[PDB]
């Protein structure tokens, strides 16, 4: 028995099934083994969908409204979003996403959900892995009242069917796209998958990529940061945000293994759902329960480790948008454990994890494993050097959006 976890990759041997059909596999998914066969006409249809502002209610919001091509397909936040929750605003005033949105560059390397050995979960789209594929993912934004707010697949089908996009989809997929709501959603997903898997959506054009391939050097400070990033006794970042500068092949450096961990970033008290003090976004365990994985609450507070390419142009950081500077996101790792009150709004422990799940939080990975009264693993100069290294991961098109002072905030329109 085998399963294919990335497009065109070799089938992987399945050793077991977890819950409703999540495969456990015998070997690590290798991103270099995927094969993305170009499909220019289907990818162009996906791009047409991506930029179509008729696909929201009220009209005016496209996928690009939260995934700006000018910012590595990460959000350029609206004024209300900047002034309030620091996550994307949806199609209406006063409605916002429940989480921050990531860059969609390199998203084609997010594998299907799987376990690999205890065995650990990997893959799935969204930060809680609740969509198995890009085709399934777009059901989220299309029908979420806090995002694009289409009322139903039936309503969206009727709307699209009256437009040129409807004609283009019917031309390619047949006339029933206008009469079968679930077929319409499925073929929107097929088109989108082709666009998001196209080569232009994985450019590998950063200065780090030039250092890996063309041997174009980084600065001494950037090299210090790279060494801290891979130092298990200081940054230890590479243990989750994995990289390999080998074979001059940039795709071995995606800065994530697509696994899950629980680092317990501070509560974003400006997020609407957090007005309820009993509400916590618990991440992966909600997906685990839907998939009937065993003992799903062991995964509460776990979130998918994000890749760090183009991180330095984002306007807010982490799944809840809680940090507004890259340096704060890095500094959090250094003193979360030694100085919890600085990070958790005065509390001595995590303020965005229910008491019931505080034991799920990682307190043994360096640098988050030092009790108060112990010196932190790194100095402030070390943190500065790590930021300098992360800034080398910006694709060439976008370097002007990084703050010119590295401790600052990304450029805003
Ligand atoms: C702002 C209101 C959004 C709009 C409009 C769209 N997306 Fe988005 N997207 C948004 C958020 C807040 C998130 C993360 C949510 C989570 O629970 O983690 C996403 C995520 C995606 C992803 C997954 C990326 C990954 O897991 O690495 C993809 C593939 C994606 N978004 C695509 C997508 C498309 C195709 C959209 C138009 C139909 C679309 N998004 C709109 C917020 C918003
Ligand atoms: C596994 C235990 C991790 C270690 C060690 C490090 N990171 Fe991490 N990182 C991890 C997760 C699960 C998350 C998401 C948490 C959430 O609440 O969303 C992150 C996130 C980041 C970010 C934000 C990226 C963004 O797109 O918002 C950055 C900037 C980042 N991590 C940096 C980073 C550095 C420099 C590390 C060594 C000091 C490091 N991380 C370690 C998981 C893990
Ligand atoms: Cl109908
Ligand atoms: Cl806050």
* CA 140 to ligand 4 center in whole angstroms: 25
By the 10 Å C-beta count (0-12 exposed, 13-18 middle, 19+ buried), 19 is classed as middle
| Nearest ligand, CA 176 | 3
The domain locations on the chain are: 2-12+37-201, 207-401
User: Around ion ligand 4, which residues have CB less than 5 A away?
Assistant: 268-269
Q: What architecture (CATH level 2) is domain 207-401?
A: Orthogonal Bundle (1.10)
96 has which bridge partners?
A: 89
Domain 2-12+37-201 and domain 207-401, same fold? Reply is yes
Distance CA 78, CA 136 (A): 27
Distance CA 135, CA 69 (A): 20
* CA 357 to ligand 3 center in whole angstroms: 43
Tokens of 60: 């005016």
Question: Residue 317 CA: which ligand 2 atom is closest?
Answer: 27
* CA 307 to ligand 2 center in whole angstroms: 8
Distance CA 82, CA 399 (A): 21
Tokens of 66: 């939260």
The order of strands in the sheet holding 2-3 is 2-3, 12-18, 22-25, 114-116, 120-122
Which residues lie below 8 Å from residue 133, measured CB to CB, with a gap of 6+? 112, 125, 189, 193
Considering only CA atoms, which of 113, 82, 112 is closest in space to residue 100?
82
Q: What architecture (CATH level 2) is domain 2-12+37-201?
A: Orthogonal Bundle (1.10)
| Residue showing tokens 């070390």 | 382
- Tell whether ligand 1 has an atom less than 6 A from the beta carbon of residue 135: no
Q: Backbone breaks in the chain (C–N > 2.5 Å) follow which residues?
A: 117
Q: How was this structure determined?
A: X-ray
């Amino acid at each position: 028995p085998t399963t294919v976890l990335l497009p065109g990759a070799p089938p992987e041997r399945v050793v077991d099934t977890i819950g409703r059909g999540t495969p456990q596999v015998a070997s690590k998914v290798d991103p270099t083994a995927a094969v993305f066969r170009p499909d220019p006409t289907l990818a162009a249809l996906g791009k047409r969908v991506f930029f179509d502002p008729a696909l929201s209610e009220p009209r005016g919001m496209s996928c690009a409204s939260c995934h700006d091509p000018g910012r590595a397909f990460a959000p350029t936040l609206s004024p209300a979003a900047l002034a309030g929750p620091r996550v994307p605003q949806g199609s209406r005033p006063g409605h916002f996403s429940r989480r921050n949105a990531p860059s969609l560059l390199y998203v084609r390397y997010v594998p299907r959900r799987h376990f690999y050995q205890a065995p650990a979960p990997f893959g799935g789209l969204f930060s809680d892995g609740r969509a198995d594929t890009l085709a399934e993912q777009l059901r989220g934004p299309l029908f979420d009242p806090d995002e694009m707010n289409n009322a139903s697949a039936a309503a969206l089908m009727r709307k699209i069917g009256r437009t040129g996009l409807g004609a283009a989809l019917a031309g390619r997929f047949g006339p029933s796209v206008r009469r079968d709501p679930e077929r319409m959603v499925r073929v929107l997903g097929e088109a989108m998958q082709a666009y998001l898997q196209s080569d232009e959506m994985a450019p590998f054009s950063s200065r780090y990529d030039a250092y890996v391939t063309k041997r174009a050097p980084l600065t001494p400070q950037e090299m210090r940061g790279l060494a801290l990033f891979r130092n298990p006794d200081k940054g230890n970042c590479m243990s989750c945000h994995t990289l390999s500068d080998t074979a001059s092949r940039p795709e071995r450096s995606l800065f994530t293994d697509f696994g899950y961990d629980a680092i317990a970033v501070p509560r974003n008290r400006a997020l609407p759902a957090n007005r309820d003090p009993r509400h916590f976004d618990n991440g992966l365990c909600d997906t685990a329960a839907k998939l009937r994985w065993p003992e799903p609450t062991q995964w509460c507070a776990y979130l998918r480790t994000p890749g760090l390419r183009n991180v330095a142009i984002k306007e807010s950081f982490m799944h809840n948008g809680v940090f507004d500077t890259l340096r704060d996101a890095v500094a959090f790792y250094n003193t979360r454990s030694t100085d919890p009150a600085r990070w958790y709004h005065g509390r001595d422990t995590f303020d965005d994890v229910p008491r019931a799940y505080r034991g799920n939080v990682n307190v043994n990975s360096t640098p988050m494993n030092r009790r108060p009264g112990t010196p932190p693993a790194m100095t402030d100069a070390d943190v500065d050097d790590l930021v300098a290294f992360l800034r080398t991961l910006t694709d060439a098109r976008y370097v002007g959006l990084m703050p010119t002072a590295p401790d600052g905030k990304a450029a805003r329109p």
